[PDB]
């Protein structure tokens, strides 16, 4: 409810996804995409696309 | 203030007459006494009104007329021209008879206390009086339970600025306030009340007792909020006082708690400084398990978690406060985390290319807790680590920028020049010594 | 002269001080005068002093009411002569 | 304090000067405001003289005394209370003026 809140929370979700992908990557040098997908709970293709975008 | 028509002689003349009138119901007696009170009030004589108020309150309380004494108190407080000292003395008499009320039940006490608090509401000459009455009220309330109402009625009073109180009782009121706030379950409010006292106050010999209770309450607050280093500092301040430091059987539990809570805290410059300072303490040597425990968490040497969890576990378990029951299960996990953090802080200082399997062997973390822990400690920013999961390698070393390399080379060359100068200046000295 | 401005500044001054819960500044600001931004603080100082005189350490409504009568009486002008209006 | 041996001192005459200090004067106690003594010829700081009291101020505070007391004043008892609540109370009880929150009064006209 309060349509503004949800319309903003979509972009908030995108920002949080980027931030979490930044946090898990920090203690790594050659991390595996499968492990990253397991930690974030996302899919390999979507994780790869988001990673390329960032 | 002077009466100019002093009634003291007239007062002692009329008092036996009123006592003779006091053999029966005091209605006429209280009427005549109120006439005397009016005479004194128009004369503005404090000394006469002292005994007038004392005798009338004693007469009303003797016949258990508190249901009328409250109304007489209200009327006399509202009386125009009544001397402030007279009201303070009479309400002092009321409280003094209240400790000797004995037969009075809860309703009479509650009504008398309410009348006293409303009468002395918003006044200066009866500040300490109202504070003490409210303390008695809050004791009565908390005896029956009702923690919320008692807690807020005591927390309404701000005792720091009462002024008329002496510095022996404001501290007591603050301590009672904090204790009731803790009982309510408002630790933030308890800490709020805590900063009111200033530590310079406790630097006195007579406040030795209150210091221990105040610091113990602070320790309880910080323990519930888990600021272990703050608990260690407060317990150190407890230890530094004479009454417990002199007594071996009293500082020994205090020093044991100090050791445990200093070891339970995470790393940091303050923790290292405090652990070194306590290690230098001579009283610690008398303790046997605590000295060894401090040795364990000070030496740059990896320790096995099961060895600690089966060696020092009994001595730690037989205790209170920390590692002392089911409610202290919250502490053992913290100790395991601290020992793992120490192991990593040692390995990163020594190792450079530790493999994942041996890293799990040393830390004893199963398989993934190791990577999780490494991630958390590097995210906070204590250690420089980088995992290589496909290769199963950890690069604990920090790559060195050219600035660091050249600064180290310059420092080495400077040390070399200084050493060659010292050698040149010692050669001549020894040549003189053995050329003689 | 605006009611909102006097309300705001009265509340600002009262917040730092020890106004009693049963004390209403709205009752004080019912009438629209030419009250300056300084007099409407010295009035509260006078009310505090009046409360201190009666040994009360928290100012009540009865002292705020009396303070208005002693710090702001008139500007004289012509209001002393009602027949002009 | 331009340097350890160069100071910018005013003069009662009015002109400013760049004056070298002596060797015994404690250089620490030399900030904006401290009165100093200047040698007439070479204009060199000599002493660290304390603050000044203008003679037209001592001539004001050194009035005789006055022998009348508050008893001598008659009729005026309420206004005496009003004046004393500003003259004596802030100077001998600055704690009620704190918890109540009143700003201490300055003037009594």
From Swiss-Prot, chain A:
PTM annotation: N-acetylated by NAT1.
Impact noted for substituting residue 51 to P: In rpn6-2; temperature-sensitive mutant that shows defects in proteasome assembly when incubated at 37 degrees Celsius
Protein name: 26S proteasome regulatory subunit RPN6
Residue ranges the record marks as coiled coil: none
Disulfide bonds: none
Similarity field: Belongs to the proteasome subunit S9 family.
Subunit structure: Component of the lid subcomplex of the 19S proteasome regulatory particle complex (also named PA700 complex). The 26S proteasome consists of a 20S proteasome core and two 19S regulatory subunits.
The gene coding this protein: RPN6
Record function comment: Component of the lid subcomplex of the 26S proteasome, a multiprotein complex involved in the ATP-dependent degradation of ubiquitinated proteins. In the complex, RPN6 is required for proteasome assembly.
Remarks, miscellaneous: Present with 16800 molecules/cell in log phase SD medium.
Parent-protein residues present: 327 to 380 of 434
Curated annotation (Swiss-Prot), chain B:
InterPro entries according to UniProt: PCI_dom, PSMD12-CSN4-like_N, PSMD12/CSN4, RPN5_C, WH-like_DNA-bd_sf, WH_DNA-bd_sf
Post-translational modification: N-acetylated by NAT1.
The keyword Hydrolase belongs to this UniProt entry's keyword annotation: no
Keyword Acetylation belongs to the record: yes
Gene3D superfamilies xrefs: Winged helix-like DNA-binding domain superfamily/Winged helix DNA-binding domain
Pfam family of the protein (one): RPN5_C
PCI domain residues: 227-401
UniProt record, GO biological process: proteasome-mediated ubiquitin-dependent protein catabolic process; protein deneddylation
Keywords, sorted A to Z: Acetylation, Proteasome
GO cellular component annotations of the record: COP9 signalosome; cytoplasm; proteasome complex; proteasome regulatory particle, lid subcomplex; proteasome storage granule
Physiological role: Acts as a regulatory subunit of the 26S proteasome which is involved in the ATP-dependent degradation of ubiquitinated proteins.
Similarity field: Belongs to the proteasome subunit p55 family.
Other remarks in the entry: Present with 5710 molecules/cell in log phase SD medium.
The name this protein goes by in its record: 26S proteasome regulatory subunit RPN5
From Swiss-Prot, chain C:
The record's account of how the chain is modified after translation: N-acetylated by NAT3.
Domain of life: Eukaryota
Location within or outside the cell: Cytoplasm; Nucleus
Record-annotated membrane-spanning stretches: none
Function text: The 26S proteasome is involved in the ATP-dependent degradation of ubiquitinated proteins. The regulatory (or ATPase) complex confers ATP dependency and substrate specificity to the 26S complex.
The family this protein is said to belong to: Belongs to the AAA ATPase family.
Protein name from the UniProt record: 26S proteasome regulatory subunit 6B homolog
Species of origin: Saccharomyces cerevisiae (strain ATCC 204508 / S288c) (Baker's yeast)
Gene label: RPT3
Swiss-Prot record, chain D:
Post-translational modification comment from the UniProt entry: N-acetylated by NAT1.
Secretion signal span: none
Highest taxon of source: Eukaryota
Function text: The 26S proteasome is involved in the ATP-dependent degradation of ubiquitinated proteins. The regulatory (or ATPase) complex confers ATP dependency and substrate specificity to the 26S complex.
Family label: Belongs to the AAA ATPase family.
Protein's UniProt name: 26S proteasome subunit RPT4
UniProt source species: Saccharomyces cerevisiae (strain ATCC 204508 / S288c)
Whole-protein residues included: 111 to 219 of 437
């Amino acid at each position: 409810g309060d349509e503004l809140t949800r319309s903003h929370f979509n972009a908030l979700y995108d920002t949080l996804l980027e931030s979490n992908l930044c946090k898990i990557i920090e203690p790594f040098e050659c991390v595996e995409i499968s492990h990253i997908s397991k930690i974030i709970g996302l899919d390999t293709q979507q994780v790869e696309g988001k990673l390329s975008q960032m | 203030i002077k009466a100019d028509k002093d009634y003291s002689q007239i007062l002692k003349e009329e008092f036996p007459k009123i006592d003779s009138l006091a053999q029966n119901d005091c209605n006429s007696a209280l009427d005549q006494l109120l006439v005397l009170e009016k005479k004194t009030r128009q004369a503005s004589d404090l000394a006469s009104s002292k005994e007038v108020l004392a005798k009338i309150v004693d007469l009303l309380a003797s016949r258990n007329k508190w249901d009328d004494l409250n109304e007489q108190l209200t009327l006399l407080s509202k009386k125009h021209g009544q001397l402030k000292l007279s009201i303070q003395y009479m309400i002092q008499k009321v409280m003094e008879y209240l400790k000797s009320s004995k037969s009075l039940d809860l309703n009479t006490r509650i009504s008398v206390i309410e009348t006293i608090r409303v009468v002395t509401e918003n006044k200066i000459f009866v500040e300490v009086e109202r504070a003490r009455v409210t303390k008695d009220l809050v004791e009565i309330k908390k005896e029956e339970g009702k923690i919320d109402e008692a807690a807020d009625i005591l927390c309404e009073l701000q005792v720091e600025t009462y002024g008329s109180m002496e510095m022996s009782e404001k501290i007591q009121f603050i301590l009672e306030q904090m204790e009731l706030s803790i009982l309510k379950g408002d630790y933030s409010q308890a800490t709020v009340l805590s900063r009111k006292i200033l530590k310079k106050t406790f630097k006195n010999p007579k406040y030795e007792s209150l210091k221990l209770e105040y610091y113990n309450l602070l320790v309880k607050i910080s323990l519930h909020k888990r600021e272990y280093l703050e608990v260690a500092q407060y317990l150190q301040e407890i230890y530094q006082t004479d009454a417990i430091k002199s007594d071996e059987a009293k500082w020994k539990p205090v020093l044991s708690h100090i050791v445990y809570f200093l070891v339970l805290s995470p790393y940091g410059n303050l923790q290292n400084d405090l652990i070194h300072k306590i290690q230098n303490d001579n009283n610690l040597k008398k303790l046997e398990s605590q000295e060894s425990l401090v040795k364990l968490f000070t030496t740059n040497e990896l320790m096995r978690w099961p060895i600690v969890q089966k060696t020092y576990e009994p001595v730690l378990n037989e205790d209170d406060l920390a590692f002392g029951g089911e409610a202290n299960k919250h502490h053992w996990e913290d100790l395991q985390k601290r020992v793992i953090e120490h192991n990593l802080r040692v390995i990163s200082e020594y190792y450079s290319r530790i493999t994942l399997l041996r890293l799990n062997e040393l830390l004893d973390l199963t398989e993934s807790q190791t990577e999780t822990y490494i991630s958390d400690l590097v995210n906070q920013g204590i250690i420089y680590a980088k995992v290589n999961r496909p290769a199963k390698i950890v690069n604990f070393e920090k790559p060195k920028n050219s600035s660091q390399l050249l600064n180290e080379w310059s420092h080495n060359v400077d040390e070399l020049l200084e050493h060659i100068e010292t050698i040149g200046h010692l050669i001549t000295k020894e040549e003189i010594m053995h050329g003689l | 002269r605006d009611r909102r401005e006097r309300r705001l500044i009265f509340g600002t001054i009262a917040s730092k001080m020890s106004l009693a819960p049963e004390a209403d500044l709205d009752s004080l600001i019912i009438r629209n005068d030419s009250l300056s931004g300084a007099v409407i603080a010295a009035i509260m100082q006078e009310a505090g002093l009046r409360a201190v005189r009666k040994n009360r350490y928290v100012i009540l409504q009865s002292d705020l009411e009396e303070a208005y009568a002693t710090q702001v009486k008139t500007d004289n002008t012509v209001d002393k002569f009602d027949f002009y209006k | 304090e331009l340097s350890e041996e160069k100071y910018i001192v005013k003069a009662s005459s009015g002109p400013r000067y760049i004056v070298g200090v002596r060797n015994s004067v404690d250089r620490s106690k030399l900030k904006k405001g401290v009165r100093v003594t200047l040698d007439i010829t070479t204009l060199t700081i000599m002493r660290i003289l304390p603050r000044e009291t203008d003679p037209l101020v001592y001539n004001m505070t050194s009035f005789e005394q006055g022998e009348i007391t508050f008893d001598g004043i008659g009729g005026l008892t309420e206004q005496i209370r009003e004046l004393r609540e500003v003259i004596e109370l802030p100077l001998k009880n600055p704690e009620i003026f704190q918890r109540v929150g009143i700003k201490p009064p300055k003037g009594v006209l």
